[PDB]
DNA sequence: TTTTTTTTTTTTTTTTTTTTTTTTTTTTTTTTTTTTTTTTTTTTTTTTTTTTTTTTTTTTTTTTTTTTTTTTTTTTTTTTTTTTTTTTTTTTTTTTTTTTTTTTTTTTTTTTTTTTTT
């Protein structure tokens, strides 16, 4: 369960993951996202 | 009772190999330096009515040099073949899940002994 929050003051967008699937480790999920960002397999991510 | 044959581990130290300490080259990483975006206000630029004298298009006619034109022979175009690259099925390998089998390490505290350095 995630939403693309859109700022009102500026046009920048931030994705917020409210919930996570079952039997998924959050630390490994964040590490995998960081690995994809470093390898440029997923584009558009600014921060994490 | 004396004397004779044979067997191996040691005096071994040297040759071969292995193990363990080393430091050149392409791939990371922190720094400074240059591209981007948002506000203030500011003289400055720029949008929109009115008048005006202008200078280019439309009555009409003229020609000549680009539009007609036909035809020879080139030469770009197309065909077949083969190589190089791109891209996707296929396979392999690895990781995570939850109950099982196995293990392995770092320090305090005192007192006494080995074990090196001066």
UniProtKB/Swiss-Prot annotation:
Query: Where's it found, cell-wise?
Result: Cytoplasm
Q: What is known of its domains?
A: An N-terminal fragment (residues 1-523) can be reconstituted with GyrB, but the complex no longer has negative supercoiling or ATP-independent DNA relaxation activities, although it is capable of DNA cleavage; ATP-dependent relaxation is inhibited by novobiocin and non-hydrolyzable ATP analogs. The fragment has ATP-dependent DNA relaxation and 30-fold improved decatenation activities, unlike holoenzyme it preferentially binds supercoiled DNA.
Q: What else is known?
A: When the enzyme transiently cleaves DNA a phosphotyrosine bond is formed between GyrA and DNA. In the presence of quinolones this intermediate can be trapped and is used as an indicator of drug toxicity. The enzyme-DNA intermediate is also the target of a number of topoisomerase poisons, including toxin CcdB.
Its assembly, as annotated, is: Heterotetramer, composed of two GyrA and two GyrB chains. In the heterotetramer, GyrA contains the active site tyrosine that forms a transient covalent intermediate with the DNA, while GyrB binds cofactors and catalyzes ATP hydrolysis. Can form a 2:2 complex with toxin CcdB in which GyrA is inactive; rejuvenation of GyrA(2)CcdB(2) is effected by CcdA.
Q: Which family does it belong to?
A: Belongs to the type II topoisomerase GyrA/ParC subunit family.
- Known role: A type II topoisomerase that negatively supercoils closed circular double-stranded (ds) DNA in an ATP-dependent manner to maintain chromosomes in an underwound state. This makes better substrates for topoisomerase IV (ParC and ParE) which is the main enzyme that unlinks newly replicated chromosomes in E.coli. Gyrase catalyzes the interconversion of other topological isomers of dsDNA rings, including catenanes. Relaxes negatively supercoiled DNA in an ATP-independent manner.
Please identify the protein, giving its name as recorded: DNA gyrase subunit A
**Source species taxonomy:** Bacteria, Pseudomonadati, Pseudomonadota, Gammaproteobacteria, Enterobacterales
Gene expressing this chain:
gyrA
């Amino acid at each position: 369960r995630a939403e693309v929050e859109v700022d009102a003051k500026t046009g920048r967008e931030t994705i917020i993951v409210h919930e996570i699937p079952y039997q998924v480790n959050k630390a490994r999920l964040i590490e995998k996202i960081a690995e994809l960002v470093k390898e440029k397999r997923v584009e558009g991510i600014s921060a994490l």
